[PDB]
Amino acid sequence: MEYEEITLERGNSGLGFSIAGGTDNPHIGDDPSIFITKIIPGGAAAQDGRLRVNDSILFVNEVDVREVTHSAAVEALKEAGSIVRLYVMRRKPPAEKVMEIKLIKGPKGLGFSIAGGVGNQHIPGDNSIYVTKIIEGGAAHKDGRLQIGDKILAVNSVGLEDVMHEDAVAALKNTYDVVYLKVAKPSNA
C-alpha cells in the first residue's frame, strides 16, 4: 500500500477526473473511502498524473475524506480552490495471473503432492488445488516446474475444484501421459 501527498493546480477550469462512491453508497460495495474511476487527457489531473484513479484520497485540501459520503467529497472538491494539496493512497499492483504448464504422467504417478476441492481443500479457505510437496527427478518437477506453492484451477479443461478432493484427485491422475495444467498466481500478491 502506497501513500503520499500532492498538489493539483487547476490547469484552467478544473483538474479533470471522475470520482464515485461515498461513505454511504460505496462505489464498490465495501469501501467507505472514495476513489477515482478515470482521468480525462486534458485537465491538470492527467497532466499532473501524480496518482491513479483507483486510489483512495486519504485526505484532500486538509479535509477529512477517508470515509465520508459522496456529498462531502463533492463539497471538498467544490471548495478545493485550484491547487489542491491532497493526500492519496494507491495500493500496489495485483498479481493475479493464469499460467499454463505441461505435466507428463509417470509410472509412480505425476510425481507431486497436491490437495484441493471440498472435503480437503488443503488451504483453510480455498477450493483451488494447491501443491505441497514434490519428488526429485519427477515428471512435473522437471517439466511442470511447479515448485511447492503453485495452484491449479483446471487441467486443460478439468474441474479440479467442482467435486471433491477425491474426484479432483482421480480426475488429475486420470489425465494423459502428457497433459497441460492450468496454474494461477495469488491475486493481489
Add this chain to the structure above:
Amino acid sequence: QVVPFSSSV
C-alpha cells in the same frame, strides 16, 4: 447507481 452519477471535476 440510478440518480447519483460520477463527479467529473
Add this chain to the structure above:
Amino acid sequence: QVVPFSSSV
C-alpha cells in the same frame, strides 16, 4: 498412504 493430508501422486 495419507490421502486426507496430501495427494502424493
